[PDB]
Ligand binder design. Structure first.
Ligand SMILES: Cn1cnc(Cn2ccc3ccc(CNCc4[nH]c5ccccc5c4[C@H]4NC(=O)c5ccc(O)cc54)cc32)c1
Ligand SMILES: Nc1nc2c(ncn2[C@@H]2O[C@H](COP(=O)(O)OP(=O)(O)O)[C@@H](O)[C@H]2O)c(=O)[nH]1
Ligand SMILES: [Mg+2]
Length: 164
């Protein structure tokens, strides 16, 4: 049948949360003003024979934050591979989400975005080590080339499906 999955994309300003979401929904990467930007996004796909209705919230980097964290079922934790501070922020997002949801098992996927860029300051191994501490998948993405974009969102749905 049909099941909705509320996904929340979190991470520092400028890592590419909006660009990743727009690549998945609108199949484009644009540097200028984009009129397709909206309050939340929707995409229907089939995963494991179930019609999955992805309902995605693209956030900014407290009452509203707590409400979207409690409402959200899965979290895409995004950093940019050429921005060490955005990677350092990840553990703070993870602890904040766990504290707000009062849960030890929160579906999450760690996303290392801007993989198309040559200016890499966070190695793949560093991100894999942080992800293994949480027992969550780590996926390298590029909203520009689409590398790993589909994988990041559907792996998060699969993590929610396993949790449920
Ligand atoms: C705030 N906002 C987001 N989209 C709209 C557009 N919109 C207008 C009516 C209308 C009805 C239905 C939906 C689908 N769900 C939107 C959505 N996707 C999420 C994915 C993950 C976590 C939270 C959401 C939500 C919001 N729902 C909530 O309870 C909530 C609480 C706090 C929020 O900051 C946002 C939401 C859009 C709607 C408004
Ligand atoms: N080269 C490259 N630029 C990206 C990528 N994702 C986002 N950007 C750019 O980085 C800037 C910030 O992106 P944005 O989606 O607004 O980040 P957000 O603040 O996390 O929502 C913009 O100039 C984007 O075009 C990516 O994968 N590769
Ligand atoms: Mg944005």
């Amino acid at each position: 049948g049909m099941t909705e999955y509320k996904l929340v994309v979190v991470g520092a300003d400028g890592v590419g949360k909006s660009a990743l979401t727009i690549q998945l929904i609108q199949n484009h990467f644009v540097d200028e003003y984009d009129p397709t930007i909206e309050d939340s996004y929707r995409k229907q796909v089939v995963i494991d024979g179930e019609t999955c209705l992805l309902d995605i919230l693209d956030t900014a980097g407290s009452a509203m934050r707590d409400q979207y964290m409690r409402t959200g079922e899965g979290f895409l934790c995004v950093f940019a591979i050429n921005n060490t501070k955005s990677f350092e922020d990840i553990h703070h997002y993870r602890e904040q989400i766990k504290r707000v949801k009062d849960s030890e098992d929160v579906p999450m996927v760690l996303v290392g975005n801007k993989s198309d860029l040559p200016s890499r300051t966070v190695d793949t191994k560093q991100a894999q080590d942080l992800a293994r501490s949480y027992g969550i998948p780590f996926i390298e993405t590029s909203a520009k080339t689409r590398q790993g974009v589909d994988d990041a969102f559907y792996t998060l749905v699969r993590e929610i499906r396993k949790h449920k």
